[PDB]
Amino acid sequence: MKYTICNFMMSVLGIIIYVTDLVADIVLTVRYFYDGQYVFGVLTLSFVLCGTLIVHCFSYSWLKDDLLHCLQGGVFTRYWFVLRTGYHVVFKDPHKEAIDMATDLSMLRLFETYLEGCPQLILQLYAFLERGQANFSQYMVIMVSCCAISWSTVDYQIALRKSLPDKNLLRGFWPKLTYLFYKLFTLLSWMLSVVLLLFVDVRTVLLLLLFLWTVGFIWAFINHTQFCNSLSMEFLYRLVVGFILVFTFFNIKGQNTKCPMSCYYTVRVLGTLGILTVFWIYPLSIFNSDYFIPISATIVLSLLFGIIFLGVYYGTYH
């Protein structure tokens, strides 16, 4: 609670993930226009353009509430302040400001991550399965985004541990690894499921997103989510958090009793495996049958692993 040295390495680790994530996106997008792949390049740059814009809009609202140049005064201006004090922390109630301001930045990175880690991983992995082998540049973004997803998720768990003392049993290295592999495996199963459908009909998957997106948006209304003050920001916050629910569940408002997660996943298990039954019972000549078996194997085994990890975490801590 005093912003020890140990979590300082956790904070500084962000940039060597963040700036590498940022430089990977810009170096990769121009490469697509350099090789002629205009569609992927412009669309992968759309995420980073929208990714930094969404957090900046939240950044301005948070900065204005706590308080042309201000337009570009976003995450970089916020991030420099904490390390300016953080460097003094290594040098030697500033502790209250340091911990509260850092954990505020951490959450904004999560929405910056899961709006750039998960949805952007789709395009690259969709452009890797299609072309077979891919190259080094695409492997860079996939690994760093996986690192970004891994780093942000565990960082959120640390924030949950320190924000409130209710989860005192969360202490230990085992909860860190179990919940981390919960995202990395459950997402991978659902991502690989969306990718497989994406080859069949692009339009159906995109329209399927709207139905799932609006359900998450409506789900914000029923829970009466409230974290921003501006009425326009309130509309935006339910939009962005609703989009995340399509990829994974996050227990909005932290006041539930495991009931909504069971409903969200009891349809996930039937939805994901139900898709596999469609392909197995109704074979498709479009997809090569040689490599379709390991993909069909890894989509179900990873999902089986994901629900298994859930029992360990909730069944012994929650």
């Epitope: 399965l129 299609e130 072309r131 077979g132 082998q133 000549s285 479009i286 090569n288 490599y291």
Partner: nanobody
């Protein structure tokens, strides 16, 4: 690139005649599953015309050119050959040959499927 594809045999030939093309893959082609050909002329995008599977040899074709193209592979020279008979005026286009590593999608006619390409040769029909 690990390998370089070389295109040759292009030239000028009268309508209804015959002409042969060769595409040579210099290097390691052990992991190459699909390789084929394309047609490209100004005013239109690339579309697949012919392709084959290195493992078996089943020559997938296009309905527009089905029953006409003659695509054969010779592993002795590590190359592929293409044969024309009774040309049509719209055949005038750039012919490129390209390969692709084995993946998941099985449709070697899509332009975005193949990984790396070659320079190509100009061919015209009179």
């Amino acid at each position: 690139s690990q390998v370089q594809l070389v295109e040759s045999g292009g030239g000028s030939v009268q309508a209804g005649g015959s002409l042969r093309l060769s595409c040579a893959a210099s290097g390691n082609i052990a992991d190459i599953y699909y390789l084929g050909w394309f047609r490209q002329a100004p005013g239109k995008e690339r579309e697949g015309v012919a392709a084959l599977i290195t493992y078996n040899g089943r020559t997938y074709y296009a309905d527009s050119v089905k029953g006409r193209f003659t695509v054969s592979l010779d592993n002795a020279k590590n190359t592929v050959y293409l044969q024309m008979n009774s040309l049509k005026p719209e055949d005038t286009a750039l012919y490129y040959c390209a390969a692709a590593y084995n993946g998941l999608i099985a449709a070697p006619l899509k332009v975005t499927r193949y990984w790396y390409w070659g320079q190509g040769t100009q061919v015209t029909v009179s």
